[PDB]
Structure formats: structure tokens, C-alpha cells
Design a binder for these strands. Structure first.
Lengths: 100, 271, 65, 116, 88, 65
RNA sequence: AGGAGGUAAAAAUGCCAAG
RNA sequence: GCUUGAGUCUCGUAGAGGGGGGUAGAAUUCCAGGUGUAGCGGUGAAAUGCGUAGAGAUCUGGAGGAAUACCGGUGGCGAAGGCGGCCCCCUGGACGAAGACUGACGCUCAGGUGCGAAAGCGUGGGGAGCAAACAGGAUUAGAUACCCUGGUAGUCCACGCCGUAAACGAUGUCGACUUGGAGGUUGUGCCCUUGAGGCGUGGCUUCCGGAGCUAACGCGUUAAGUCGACCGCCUGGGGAGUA
């Protein structure tokens, strides 16, 4: 499996339903042999430019290791979830377990 | 799949058939057909109201589910099928309780695909949702205009409607014409675009190829005598009138829409 | 770009836009794509740069200053 | 009148002409004056001096608002810039901050071919 | 492509042992596994002209090795091409 | 003249906004390698780091936002 | 040392002459 | 038979190499609205054009298409044409270290086949910005031009076609050999990494220059030097790359 580095930011009005969103996503990962190597929640921090006339989005960090198709429905989960206002995926050369 | 047929005859030379090998080569499903007699363009008074409608091939009507209101039950596309009443193809679907129905065929659809209506249906082509649940920006077809009425927009082949915005109670749709229309957000729509998208790439080739499709020859206005048309007459191919219909209203650019009833729902006209 | 310095203003002294552009990106995209004249005007810009670097390392003759 | 105290001065220093528009903080315009309006039709409006009299002719177009604090937003390549700000400082306005809002694309639109 | 365990499967089937990795029977089989794998890549994209040049290099290098093998040992050659389905 | 992760070894990560702030200017543009003396390998690395950090709004694209 | 400019930086027209 | 040529495997590294799909911000234009007042725009100077039906300026909201500022570098990659936002999926090649393996499998290549900028062509889309044609205004002896205001094809996408270019380092491919210097870039070994160092060793690349060569200019270990293998081509200018 490839390692990925999912970062997604959440609408501030759904910042309270952030940790409920996490174990929904881990069960998709861990339910298909996906090991998780970070979860570091960055809380709400102020955006450097207004996204959809919002500021202070809620940042999440993942650093998981899954097969290719397993994160593919996770990416389509992000497109139709209207509480996440953007999300980027990165990849391997390691599985990293560190801080900011 | 468009195929340019080889010119072994005049009238066979310019034929491009669009042939789909996935259509069910067989008889259609029996309990979803009733008869559909032609009219020839004549109404109760028996007079030809719309011209150039004529013979054909005695085609039978197929009951197509346009409401798609059997909700929460999955359905499996049994086979695609040919339909002589549309430009699109139809797909005979089988619900889990044994009910068979005809629906329009979206683009990426084949036998074995699983579809579902209702609110909780997934975002996949063929699925039917109320438009307050479809994400804005999506590409839908078979769109209603009043909730529960049916499906009335984007039904022909290759046609689709893009959802542009959503003001809470209403949904703006960019229609295939280019007209941005408003519609109630509780109306259903089927995802994806309608299949058979290369229907426009066919050419008939023959005069008779149109003639067995139902149409009749359209004799031009300027060939008639002046008692028959507002054009017409002239010793030797004249024309000196502004072009009009046979009933004498301007035909090259004259806006005939006058409704004032559903004018509230049109954000921008076709351009 | 943005300038305050907040107390003792007294004078503009905007080297700040000159430290980023002040004309240099604006008197460039004023017109004229060219699409290949950059590739030749960058080349002579580098060619004159390395030739004067060869010149300043070749000044020591006498010239009687 | 509304009599607002703090305002924004926009300066559209193009190559041919300069436009000095004084607005409020929100952006609603209060008064303006250009180099072409001050006379100087032709080559004279493309000079720094015509920018200077355009700013002065805009300062007494907002005397009825009593603006005392101006933040300057200069925009453009023209010779207006470093002379039309000095005319606002001599006009009796307190320059709170200067910034250039010169619209620079992040490389896309094809510019014209012009002027052989 | 042709990941590391997939080449390990081929190099043990055709060679004398696992470190025997350069023999003609191994190389011909190893190219054929990659050539057959890339058929699905070009049944798709079809305009990857830069990657198809690497495919034709693998085709022509396979043909040169078989033409080497048919000259040296025609017994192993006929045993090889039936073992992968070649020689149109 | 000085150096970077050629000695303080790194494989630049975009989430280190403290270190990345040193390598943009006040208008948010990336400062060139001729200024900071960064090796050309790492200047490519932090260019991708800044371009990713601009996407996540951890760094601004301009100052005029 | 390279970079940027600077009341400034250009660009109005300006053909022909025979062994 | 042999191992140096050629090739395979293991392990890493760099990259605008290609194809597909997403998405991001800056700007232009348009649309709507607020404010607001007579100009704006343009030029050598003008006018056409736009503007009291309220433009330009400014602010908010939207819709679109196209291109990717800064990084950015005689930097990188690709057989060449070429390839620059970011992210994923699929995929090619190169190079290095240390070993193992095959055992001359090689080099070149007429005909053949494939790729091949831009313009163009076909069908279907799309169309912001530019812009052939075209129109108006200038300039001028004239101005079918340069300049200005507009502006269609096109530029963009998909799929076919065309098969050309100052397609150029105007230098065919492959191999060997023959003083140096300063760089760039990308690997790697060793030593005190003690610290950005020191010592080596590979790949690619830019500039200067020695012998030599050249008609000269110049080329100069990436040769146009000294040689070998194979291919393409030339034989006065015009007519003519035409019939």
C-alpha cells in the first residue's frame, strides 16, 4: 500500500462535528487494512486569504497508509461533503509520525 | 458507432448509420407496450393542423417511467433497448421486488448496472434525487418542472441540464438551449446525461429514409401560387416579400413567446 | 507594496514598490507575447553578463591611470 | 452631507491620463478629478504636473465632507504616482498609509501585439 | 513498471536459479510480461506517444534476443515461444 | 552567501510555515535563489512547498487579498 | 557586480537619380 | 569458449518526459447593483469609438473562457518537434553505487513503418483575451501599409487529416584516441560530519583556450583534431525545387 498525507480543512460552523467525521474516515481506512500514522488536529486557525468569504477554518491532518482505491472513495467523500471546503492528498517515500 | 456506408447505389452513398451493438436484438418487453396509432397531423376536426406529418412504420408505444418514484428499492439494468418513440434509448430495469420498468438510458450505462431512486440514493448516473440533494454544478437530465409531475426537460439524446445555483427554495438550471431557468428545488432529476449522444451524427441519405420516419415533403412557399402562400407567384422565380409563414406572420426573427404567466421562472432568455 | 512605518511619515520614499516591481512586471506585460523573443533576449542577457564577468577579470594590463 | 472623517484616495495613474477618486472606507465615491478635466488635453495630461493639479482639483471637491485621514491606493504605470501623492499631502490631508494595488496577472490573458 | 515480486516470479520460472537473471530465456520472458502489461495502458490512452516509444524498444529488443536464441539453440527457442505464445 | 539545509539537513516539508516565511517576501512572492544562496535542489523543493502552502491558505498568494 | 529607472528615453512624414 | 562491447536483476536519486482526471489563486471581459460626476479612451499629434439613456473611476455579487506571475537559472527533461500552478492515477527513459547473471546477443541502414512546431482542413463543441480577413479613423503625393478604434476565421477541446519550418549546434549515427582552465547541474566513495569543509570518482551541460585543422571566420576531449564502420547528399548561376 501507498502512504498518503491527507489534509482537509473544515467549515468553522461544522468545527464541532469534526471528531465525528474522523472515525467515519478511519473506519474506511482501517476497515481495509489501512494503518494510520498521525491524526494531528490543528484546531481552528485563521486563513491567509478568504475561502468562500470564510476565515478561521478547522484543519485536520491524516498521514495514512491505504490502497489506491480506498482513498479514492475518500476523495469523492470530500467532494460531496459540504463541511470540508478543500482537501489535498500527497504521498509516500515514508510513513511519517511527527508534529507541525 | 457511426459508419459511412459504401456507395453501391445512389442513395446508399451518403448514408451514415449510427449502429449500437448493445441494443437488445429481440422483441420488446410485452406488458409495457400499448398501441400508438398515427394521426397524420389531423385533429378532432379532421383537418391537418400541423403539416408534413405522414406515414411511417406503425411503431408501438413503450411506457417509460418518467416520475421514477419507486424509492428506496434498488434496480438492475437488465438490457438496453431500442425505442422508436424517442431519439434516446431505453433501459429495461428490474427492481428487487420483481417489478420491471422502462427508464431513459443515461450515458455510462450498461446491463448489470445498479440504480436507485429516492432521497438517499448515491451520486451516480442513473440515480434519481430531488434537486435539493444534488450537488450544485452537477449534470442531470430528466428534470421535472413541478414536483411529482413527471420528467420534462433534457429527455432527448445526448441532452443534459446543468444545475447552476440554489436559492434555498428554487434551483437555477442552465438548460440545453442556453436559457437559464429557475425551477422548484423539490423537483426530481436523474443524474448524468442521456445516452445515444451520437444520434445527431447520422444522415439519412435517401428521400425515402425521411419518408419512412414519418415526415412528408415540405414544398417551399415560393413555388406556390399567390392564393396558396403569401410568397408565391411571379413570372419566372421572383421573391419580393419579407419572408413569412403560410398564415402571414414574420418568420425570420420575430419573438412569438408571449406568456406572462411563467415569465417569473426565466432568469435569462436563450441567446 | 504596502507602506505605513506608522509614526514619522513626512515623505513618501517608496523604494518598496521598486523593491518588488514598480514598473518591471507592468512595463513588460504591457504588450507583445513574442513567445520566443524571451528565449533570445534571455540568452543575450546571460551572454552579456558572462562576458563582462570575463572582462572585469581581464582589466589588468596597464592603461596608465 | 454625510460628513465622514476617514477616506480612501484611489489614483488611476495610467500612461495617458490620471484619475484621482476619493472614496470612503467602504468604497463609495465622493468626488473625483482627472488630468483631462483640468485642461491639458493631449500631451499635457501625461505629465506629472497635470496629475498634481488633478489631485488639488479633487481635494476641493470633497471639502464638504471634511475628510482628514486619507489612505492612498495608487494603481498604474503612469507618471502620475509620485507627484499626485505629494499634492494630497500639501492639500492638508493626513496620509495614514500608502499601498499600490496595481493589478498584475499571474500570467494569463494575451496582451496586445501592438506598436511597431 | 513490473514490480519487484513480479520479476521475482519470472526469474525463477525461466532461469536456472534466482540469481540467474540475465539469460536469454529470462530476458525474453521478462520483456513479454511488461509488453503484455502495457496493452491495457494503450487500449486506454492511445495518445501516449512518448511512452509507446519505450514499448517499441521493448518489442524490438525482444525480437533481437529471440533471433539470437533461434541461431544458438533452436531447441530452447521452440520451447520458449510456445511457453509464452509468440511467433505469429 | 550563506547556506540552508545543505548543513541543517531537511527534505522540505510544507507545513513548516515558520521556516517558509523566511523564503517569501512581503508581497508573498518567492525570493530568488540568487539572494538566499539556497542550493538549486532545495530551491525547487521549497518552491513546491510554498506552492502547496498557498493552496491550503497557510501562506498568502499576494498581499492584496 | 547585476538590477531598475530618471524634465528624460525617442519613434509624425521624408520617394527618386538613369551610361 | 572467454569477458571488456551490448544486455538483465537488486538499491536509490533527479526531472516543465508523456497520457488521463481533478482543483487553486491573480487578472481581463461581460452581467447585475450601490456610490458618483463629466468626461473617458487613444496618439507624434489627432479623430473614429465610448459617455448625461449617466460612462470612465470605485465597491459588492455573479457567469465564463484561457493562460499559469514570483520561483526561473547559456537550469532540467525528451529521439527530434517540444515540455512550466498544484494534486492524484497510469506510464516511458536516463543516471549512480555495490554485486550477481547472459556470453558478441553488436554498429549502421536503401526500401518500409512510426513520431513530427505553427498555419491550414473535416466533423462536433467552446469562445474571455488576442487577432488574418474586413470596416472606420489617421498619416501620406498616394497608403489596399506601419499607427488608432472595432472585429470574423483562427487561437482552446475532442477525434481524424496535413507532413512542412532558418524542423538550426545551418554540423548523420556509432566507437576509439589526443594538453588545459573556470563554471553550472545531478549521483556517489573516503576522511577529523568534527562546521558551511578535505580528498576522490561517475553522468549531463555552459564558456574560454593549446596542439592540430580550416579559404578564413572559427572549431577546439560535447572537434570542424587523429582514425574506423555504415548511411544520406553535392557537381557553375538563372530557368527551378518549376513543368
Amino acid at each position: 500500500m501507498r502512504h498518503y498525507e491527507i489534509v482537509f480543512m473544515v467549515h468553522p460552523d461544522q468545527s464541532e462535528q469534526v471528531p465525528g467525521m474522523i472515525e467515519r474516515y478511519t473506519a474506511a481506512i482501517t476497515g481495509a487494512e489501512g494503518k494510520i500514522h498521525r491524526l494531528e488536529d490543528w484546531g481552528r486557525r485563521q486563513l491567509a486569504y478568504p475561502i468562500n468569504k470564510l476565515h478561521k477554518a478547522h484543519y485536520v491532518l491524516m498521514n495514512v497508509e491505504a490502497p489506491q482505491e480506498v482513498i479514492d472513495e475518500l476523495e469523492t467523500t470530500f467532494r460531496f461533503n459540504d463541511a470540508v471546503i478543500r482537501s489535498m492528498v500527497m504521498r509516500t517515500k515514508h510513513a511519517v509520525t511527527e508534529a507541525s | 458507432a457511426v459508419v459511412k456506408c459504401k456507395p453501391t447505389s445512389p442513395g446508399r452513398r451518403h448514408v451514415v448509420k449510427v449502429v449500437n451493438p448493445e441494443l437488445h436484438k429481440g422483441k420488446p418487453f410485452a406488458p409495457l407496450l400499448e398501441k400508438n396509432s398515427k394521426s397524420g397531423g389531423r385533429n378532432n376536426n379532421g383537418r391537418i393542423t400541423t403539416r408534413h406529418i405522414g406515414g411511417g412504420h406503425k411503431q408501438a408505444y413503450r411506457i417509460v417511467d418518467f416520475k421514477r418514484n419507486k424509492d428506496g428499492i434498488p434496480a438492475v439494468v437488465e438490457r438496453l433497448e431500442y425505442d422508436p418513440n424517442r431519439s434516446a434509448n431505453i433501459a429495461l430495469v428490474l427492481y428487487k421486488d420483481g417489478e420491471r420498468r422502462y427508464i431513459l438510458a443515461p450515458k455510462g450505462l450498461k446491463a448489470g448496472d445498479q440504480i436507485q431512486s429516492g432521497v438517499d440514493a448515491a451520486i451516480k448516473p442513473g440515480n434519481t434525487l430531488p434537486m435539493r440533494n444534488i450537488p450544485v454544478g452537477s449534470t442531470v437530465h430528466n428534470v421535472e418542472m413541478k414536483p411529482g409531475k413527471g420528467g420534462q426537460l433534457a429527455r432527448s439524446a445526448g441532452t443534459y441540464v446543468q444545475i447552476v445555483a440554489r436559492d434555498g427554495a428554487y434551483v437555477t438550471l442552465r438548460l440545453r438551449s442556453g436559457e437559464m431557468r429557475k425551477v422548484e428545488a423539490d423537483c426530481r432529476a436523474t443524474l448524468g446525461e442521456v445516452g445515444n449522444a451520437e444520434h445527431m451524427l447520422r444522415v439519412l441519405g435517401k428521400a425515402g429514409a425521411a419518408r419512412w420516419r414519418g415526415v412528408r415533403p415540405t414544398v417551399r412557399g415560393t413555388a406556390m401560387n399567390p392564393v396558396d402562400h403569401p410568397h408565391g407567384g411571379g413570372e419566372g422565380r421572383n421573391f419580393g416579400k419579407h419572408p413569412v409563414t403560410p398564415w402571414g406572420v414574420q418568420t425570420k426573427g420575430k419573438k412569438t413567446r408571449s406568456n406572462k404567466r411563467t415569465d417569473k421562472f426565466i432568469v435569462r432568455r436563450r441567446s | 507594496i504596502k507602506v505605513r512605518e506608522n509614526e514619522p511619515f513626512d515623505v513618501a520614499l517608496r523604494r518598496f514598490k521598486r523593491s518588488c516591481e514598480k514598473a518591471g512586471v507592468l512595463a513588460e506585460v504591457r504588450r507583445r507575447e513574442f513567445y520566443e523573443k524571451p528565449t533570445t533576449e534571455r540568452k543575450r542577457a546571460k551572454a552579456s553578463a558572462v562576458k563582462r564577468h570575463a572582462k572585469k577579470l581581464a582589466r589588468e594590463n596597464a592603461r596608465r591611470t | 452631507r454625510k460628513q465622514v472623517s476617514d477616506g480612501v484616495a484611489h489614483i488611476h495613474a495610467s500612461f495617458n491620463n490620471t484619475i484621482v477618486t476619493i472614496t470612503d472606507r467602504q468604497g463609495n465615491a465622493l468626488g473625483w478629478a482627472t488630468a483631462g478635466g483640468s485642461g491639458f488635453r493631449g500631451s499635457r495630461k501625461s505629465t506629472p504636473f497635470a496629475a498634481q493639479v488633478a489631485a488639488e482639483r479633487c481635494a476641493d471637491a470633497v471639502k464638504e465632507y471634511g475628510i482628514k485621514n486619507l489612505e492612498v491606493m495608487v494603481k498604474g504605470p503612469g507618471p502620475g504616482r509620485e507627484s499626485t501623492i505629494r499634492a494630497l499631502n500639501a492639500a492638508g490631508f493626513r496620509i495614514t498609509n500608502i499601498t499600490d494595488v496595481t493589478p498584475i496577472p499571474h500570467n494569463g490573458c494575451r496582451p496586445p501585439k501592438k506598436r511597431r | 513498471s513490473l514490480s519487484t515480486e513480479a520479476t521475482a516470479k519470472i526469474v525463477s520460472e525461466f532461469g536456472r536459479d534466482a540469481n540467474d537473471t540475465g539469460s536469454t530465456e529470462v530476458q525474453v520472458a521478462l520483456l513479454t510480461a511488461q509488453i503484455n502489461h502495457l496493452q491495457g495502458h494503450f487500449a486506454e490512452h492511445k495518445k501516449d506517444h512518448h511512452s509507446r516509444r519505450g514499448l517499441l524498444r521493448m518489442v524490438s529488443q525482444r525480437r533481437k534476443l529471440l533471433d539470437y536464441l533461434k541461431r544458438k539453440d533452436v531447441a530452447r527457442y521452440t520451447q520458449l515461444i510456445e511457453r509464452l505464445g509468440l511467433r505469429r | 552567501f550563506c547556506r540552508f539545509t545543505a548543513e541543517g539537513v531537511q527534505e522540505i516539508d510544507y507545513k513548516d510555515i515558520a521556516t517558509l516565511k523566511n523564503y517569501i517576501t512581503e508581497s508573498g512572492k518567492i525570493v530568488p535563489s540568487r539572494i538566499t544562496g539556497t542550493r538549486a535542489k532545495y530551491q525547487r523543493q521549497l518552491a513546491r512547498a510554498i506552492k502547496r502552502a498557498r493552496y491550503l491558505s497557510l501562506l498568502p498568494y499576494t498581499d492584496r487579498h
